[PDB]
Amino acid sequence: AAKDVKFGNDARVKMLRGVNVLADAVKVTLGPKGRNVVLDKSFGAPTITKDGVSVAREIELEDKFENMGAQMVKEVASKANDAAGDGTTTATVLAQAIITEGLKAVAAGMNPMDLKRGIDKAVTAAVEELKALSVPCSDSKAIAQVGTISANSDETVGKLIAEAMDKVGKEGVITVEDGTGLQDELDVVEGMQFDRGYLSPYFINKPETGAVELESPFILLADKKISNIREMLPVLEAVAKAGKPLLIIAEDVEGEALATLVVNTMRGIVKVAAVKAPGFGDRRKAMLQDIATLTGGTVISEEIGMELEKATLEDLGQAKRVVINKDTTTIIDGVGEEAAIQGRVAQIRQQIEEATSDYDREKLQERVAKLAGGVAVIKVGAATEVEMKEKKARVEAALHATRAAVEEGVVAGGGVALIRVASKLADLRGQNEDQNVGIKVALRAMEAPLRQIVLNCGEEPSVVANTVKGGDGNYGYNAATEEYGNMIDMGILDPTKVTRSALQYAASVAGLMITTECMVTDL
Amino acid sequence: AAKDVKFGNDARVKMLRGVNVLADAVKVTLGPKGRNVVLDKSFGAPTITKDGVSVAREIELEDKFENMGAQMVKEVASKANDAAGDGTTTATVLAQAIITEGLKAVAAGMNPMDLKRGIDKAVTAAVEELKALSVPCSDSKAIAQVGTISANSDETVGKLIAEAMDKVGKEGVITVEDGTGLQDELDVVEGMQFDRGYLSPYFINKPETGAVELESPFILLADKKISNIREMLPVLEAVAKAGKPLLIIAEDVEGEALATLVVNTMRGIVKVAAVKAPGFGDRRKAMLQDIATLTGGTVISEEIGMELEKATLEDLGQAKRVVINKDTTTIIDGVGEEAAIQGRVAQIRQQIEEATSDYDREKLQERVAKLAGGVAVIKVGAATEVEMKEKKARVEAALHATRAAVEEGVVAGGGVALIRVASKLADLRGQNEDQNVGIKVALRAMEAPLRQIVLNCGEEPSVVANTVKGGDGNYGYNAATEEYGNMIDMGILDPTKVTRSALQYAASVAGLMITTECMVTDL
Amino acid sequence: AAKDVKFGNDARVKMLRGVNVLADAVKVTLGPKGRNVVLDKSFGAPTITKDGVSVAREIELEDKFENMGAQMVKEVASKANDAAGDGTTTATVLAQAIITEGLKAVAAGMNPMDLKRGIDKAVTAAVEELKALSVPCSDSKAIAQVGTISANSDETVGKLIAEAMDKVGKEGVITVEDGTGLQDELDVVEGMQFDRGYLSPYFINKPETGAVELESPFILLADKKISNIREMLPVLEAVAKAGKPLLIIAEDVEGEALATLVVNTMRGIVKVAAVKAPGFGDRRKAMLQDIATLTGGTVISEEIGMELEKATLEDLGQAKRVVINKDTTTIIDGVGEEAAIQGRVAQIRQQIEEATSDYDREKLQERVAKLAGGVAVIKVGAATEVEMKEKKARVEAALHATRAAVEEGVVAGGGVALIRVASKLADLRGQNEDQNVGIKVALRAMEAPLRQIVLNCGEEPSVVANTVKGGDGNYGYNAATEEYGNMIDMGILDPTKVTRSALQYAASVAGLMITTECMVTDL
Ligand SMILES: Nc1ncnc2c1ncn2[C@@H]1O[C@H](COP(=O)(O)OP(=O)(O)OP(=O)(O)O)[C@@H](O)[C@H]1O
Ligand SMILES: Nc1ncnc2c1ncn2[C@@H]1O[C@H](COP(=O)(O)OP(=O)(O)OP(=O)(O)O)[C@@H](O)[C@H]1O
Ligand SMILES: Nc1ncnc2c1ncn2[C@@H]1O[C@H](COP(=O)(O)OP(=O)(O)OP(=O)(O)O)[C@@H](O)[C@H]1O
Numbered sequence A, B, C: 001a002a003k004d005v006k007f008g009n010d011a012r013v014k015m016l017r018g019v020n021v022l023a024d025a026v027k028v029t030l031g032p033k034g035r036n037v038v039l040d041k042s043f044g045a046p047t048i049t050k051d052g053v054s055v056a057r058e059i060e061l062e063d064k065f066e067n068m069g070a071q072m073v074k075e076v077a078s079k080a081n082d083a084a085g086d087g088t089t090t091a092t093v094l095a096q097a098i099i100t101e102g103l104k105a106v107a108a109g110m111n112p113m114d115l116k117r118g119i120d121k122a123v124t125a126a127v128e129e130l131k132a133l134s135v136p137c138s139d140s141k142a143i144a145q146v147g148t149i150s151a152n153s154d155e156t157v158g159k160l161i162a163e164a165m166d167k168v169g170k171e172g173v174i175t176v177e178d179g180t181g182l183q184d185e186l187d188v189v190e191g192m193q194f195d196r197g198y199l200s201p202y203f204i205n206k207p208e209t210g211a212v213e214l215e216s217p218f219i220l221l222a223d224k225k226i227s228n229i230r231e232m233l234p235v236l237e238a239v240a241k242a243g244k245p246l247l248i249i250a251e252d253v254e255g256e257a258l259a260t261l262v263v264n265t266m267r268g269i270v271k272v273a274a275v276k277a278p279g280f281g282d283r284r285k286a287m288l289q290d291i292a293t294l295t296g297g298t299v300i301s302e303e304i305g306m307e308l309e310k311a312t313l314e315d316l317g318q319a320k321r322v323v324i325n326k327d328t329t330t331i332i333d334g335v336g337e338e339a340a341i342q343g344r345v346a347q348i349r350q351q352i353e354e355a356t357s358d359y360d361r362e363k364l365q366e367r368v369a370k371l372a373g374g375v376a377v378i379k380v381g382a383a384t385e386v387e388m389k390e391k392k393a394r395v396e397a398a399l400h401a402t403r404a405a406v407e408e409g410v411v412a413g414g415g416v417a418l419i420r421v422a423s424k425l426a427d428l429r430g431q432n433e434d435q436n437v438g439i440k441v442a443l444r445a446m447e448a449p450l451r452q453i454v455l456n457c458g459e460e461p462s463v464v465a466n467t468v469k470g471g472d473g474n475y476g477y478n479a480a481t482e483e484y485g486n487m488i489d490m491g492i493l494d495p496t497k498v499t500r501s502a503l504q505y506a507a508s509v510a511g512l513m514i515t516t517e518c519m520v521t522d523l
């Protein structure tokens, strides 16, 4: 029908305003200062967002345009957030600065394309500089500091991350679970995780993450792939004479062969999940066996000649809970048998030694390793359930950031890298003036987040920024110290990856926002 | 869509106003003074709330924001109320004071985080002080006084609690039932209670408590777990040739194995409940046997080879009523056989003696103890049914508070502990000024409820508070006396646990309220 | 009309907003930077206004409350403006800062009285510091600079002031007149000034100043006081033939008798003025003689026996123009008799030497001095009449400021004194915290105007202010230099008096605003 059109600046402004609103909350929240943000929920009690990210999520704009603009930033921010594990706010902050400048440039009427290109070019240059700048991660104490950064002055999270990290080992994966109680618990977990996808997003559970968690799942393992429903059905009868979420492991499902019959034919009332059996070939079988032992269930294979129909519920193992993500499917804890698990591990271990070949050894060793799992679980307590969820999310983000940060090594925090790079970046020129301005804009954007921290300090960011820029090498401002010192010496370092990730995303967002001169909507 | 946003103070104010409104009623009601509050009900006759708590429940705010804010307080208050058994109002009162100050501080613009931390710190300090301050509970006369406090000058409740408590014994559990008639009846009850959960909240009955009560329940006991519906079904046929609520006892239900078939397949028209059979192993069987005798029903086990299908309704016992809560499932009174029950008890008792081992003795002794139950039931009469319900609720709260109070021992009432602690607390300083103010705020919050009582007195709380603070040791004001005397000497003591519980919750609430600077809602 | 009564912040808020609006324009204009302001006109092209004072004058607020608030500032500012001659804006700027803070404090709910007291206390302290800080005025080159400051980068004004000042002498009074033409004209004017009041404000001329200027005045001098009209009348009759405006000098004119008859009876179509003859006794006569010679008119005394009636117009002298103010009455230029005037001066001069006594010498010397000194007049040209008026006003202000500045000596400009004093002030504490905050507020207020200049520079005032504060001695920022240097060395100095005056007034204004708890207005 009729469209309400806003031209250029008009289109931009809606996004910009939305961006600003979202950004403002985020910026203040970013850094230790932001205590909290809260807003209502349509259903249920209103959500409260401790984190900057959560704030962005929480914040919705009444205006469609503004909201959409806000959403765009958030979505990018989240993506950066996931990968980096941290720097969600930073990306948002960066984006806002870039966007605003871009918009102004838009006001200038310089073709945004050059600017975008310039920005991208600047980003690339900055990235390169950052990479060189970045240095190896410091020790666990640093790690805690890294954790704290993700923490946003959540001391506990950093401590937990460090503590979990120490026990597990940096290499060892750490998993987070909701705390049993207010006090956190760190437990080594028994179980194995195998990287398998979820066959269909349909399987994908309710939660936003889309990882599916089953409570007291039942595990049916078949070495053979599950061709059709019918074979499955007798299992199902045991299972629809069941209910708490059944997990099914099949070597393969033809999303052709299984899916049509299963979905239509099968009520699927009981929760069901399907995963491909880990590994392939004998190894796959071996993995299945390992899983089966861990589950405590039994596996049925054609070679065995056991029938799925014949197999009862008992054959199916149970898990305390299972979490599945597209990348990987894990069982938090199979009931298993303590002896059984150990025995299998030993047997596999013996096998590992036994096999002459490295390859054989590797498969076995991998298998054994999985069984122990080396997994650590972290529980987060909270005053309230809501808090716990919030805390947990923060913790998870921190963990990812920390892990990434350590491997990458950590660049000086405080946006020191960003400021430092920008200066170098400034010298570089874009192909054309429009590009040049964009490049400058990007540089400006980088500078801003340093200022924001300063603003939180209440110190005038101009002086700090100037001083920071002036200092060669790694120079930065420590909010807590409110003294000038080497970032490395300070030991507060922001992860290279997180910084890089955030910057890239922010730049991308900004460019996108910049590009759309005009927006059209239905009236 | 578009959102209506209130920033910071705007967000807070809605909550604050709501809090104040709710709080005001609660505060006045708190203490003997508050005669009553009443408001309409959407359906049915409007509820009338004698109690402060009920007032809060009753009071709803038209404004969503205000209402939500009010709700938040109430929910916390209720939680405190449950645990403490008393002090529901106190928590509310405390919260309001804290919130208001926090809001003002919010107006100050000091970061609430520090304040919250300070408040928490203050709370912790106060708690420690309180614990030291607290002293052992006094005698039953004191108990009645304790009861009266929960009573809010409900003399009857305190008397009933004391009376019930005396007969049952403090240790012995006391249960409350609606009064048969206006006159209360205290009867020792025959029956056993076993701690078992309800399999599903679905089972959970209509009432808010969620405890499920069945009228004239039928009890089917199986030693063996009920794997599937089908085995159940023939029982059901007897029971679908039935209607008034069937209770089912199964050793285990796979919420996998039973649930899918039962729910979908089974109409479940007749009320059904499921509980796991108490105990495990032989003891579980023994417990089942004890239950079976008490029920007067019979239990069927595979070992017996009796069939569930074979078993008739007659095999199933009947109970006058059953109440189930997640923690525990109890049968108020199985029809049982008087002789049978006694005989079983004796047999078990003999067994207890017979067993050499302590362990064997313990299991038997526990079993025997349950059968007698040592249970006492209290009936509350009322002029009207509504009143009775109100009274009953109050009675229950009092009982919990009293029981907790006795074990803990009772601290001086009148908020004496609170005032006393605060002074000590005041000396302690928070890490930072913002924290400091919050700490002070908390202290102020503690003081307030003393004032409220004074206000009810009409005496100027300032003088009283000052005097109370001035007095060392336990110093307090007795409203009734309107004379200064030792709280202990007065013998009016508020339970340590209740006070502690309320304070902690109130603090938590306040912090939460404080945190949310701004609230966003859809327009 | 009706009355609307309000109490509370709301009254304040209106004032604050009004203040800000006026202040903002003024602040930007203040310092060389403020380009301009414009006004509308009902008829003709809209007027355009210049300097900040003019800006403030031009600015009116639609809202009564806001307007009134704005007005209050302006009135005080003008008063300061008059006395200082400069610093109108500064006072306004200071006031705004103070007011806002005070208002915030009002928001705080601290009792403003303490704050006002604290502010006053701070002001006093600051004043003392300033006085000590102040140093003697520099030479004419400095004077021009002083002029420029009043100039607000009006080079011409400063030059004119300096030029006029040089010729006249600093001590010598300089008068400003509208320029004959675009080019300014500086003419020294012969004449004597004697401090005499205007008998009645009725006499007071049209212009706002109320000083009365007569064009080609005729001077009638009577040694005797002019008791009544009748004696005057025959002079007047000649005056009728006259009509060049008549000035009357009488020893004393009783207001009632003369004025009543004169005003009512006499149309007074020709302007008439009356002044008391300068001096008393013989000296008065002598002064009269001196005046008479300077006028070139003759004086009639009873002792002489000359009759006023007898005296013709010729006896009355003429002046090119006369200006009268309440404090003093001056004749810009009597036509005089060249020979007569000179001879008398010589005679007086001889007398001065001649007189043995100091007293005689003093009177004579004073008499000669008045004639000798003469007066200097400055004409200001303009592109347009409107401009000229504006320029003239600015010039006048500058002149006053310069004159004051020179005598006082000039303190470092740039608000350096203000910033410097504040630091010292900060140490001083008010009696009570509320006072303390007010004191701090005042200090903050002082700092602000430095910032404003910086802001105009575009440099971040924070750094500058910090730097300025840090420097001991006279440290300041020169806008033009944009380099740090000694203010004195720079030679840019703001007059002590002007600074002091502005500060005091501003403080007074701020204090006043804070109070006024209740306001009543028409509905
Ligand atoms: N306690 C602290 N002391 C000093 N600097 C800190 C502290 N906490 C964080 N920082 C700095 O502030 C920035 C990190 O804050 P934050 O983690 O909020 O930003 P973010 O990661 O972008 O936001 P989010 O964590 O919500 O994704 C970094 O530059 C970091 O070095
Ligand atoms: N009859 C009484 N005489 C003296 N003081 C009393 C009396 N009844 C109560 N109090 C005091 O008043 C406070 C208890 O009142 P109340 O029980 O209403 O508060 P509450 O427990 O917080 O509210 P609710 O009982 O609704 O949860 C205590 O400090 C108690 O010592
Ligand atoms: N050309 C200039 N270069 C450097 N500083 C200047 C210059 N002109 C003025 N200043 C400084 O700026 C301030 C004076 O500006 P201005 O005269 O506008 O303020 P004001 O006297 O308060 O306003 P008004 O002149 O309208 O009363 C002083 O501190 C003065 O030293």
Ligand SMILES: [Mg+2]
Pocket: A086, A087, A088, A089, A149, A150, A151, A152
């Ligand atoms: Mg972070």
Ligand SMILES: [Mg+2]
Pocket: B086, B087, B088, B089, B149, B150, B151, B152
């Ligand atoms: Mg109570």
Ligand SMILES: [Mg+2]
Pocket: C086, C087, C088, C089, C149, C150, C151, C152
């Ligand atoms: Mg000036």
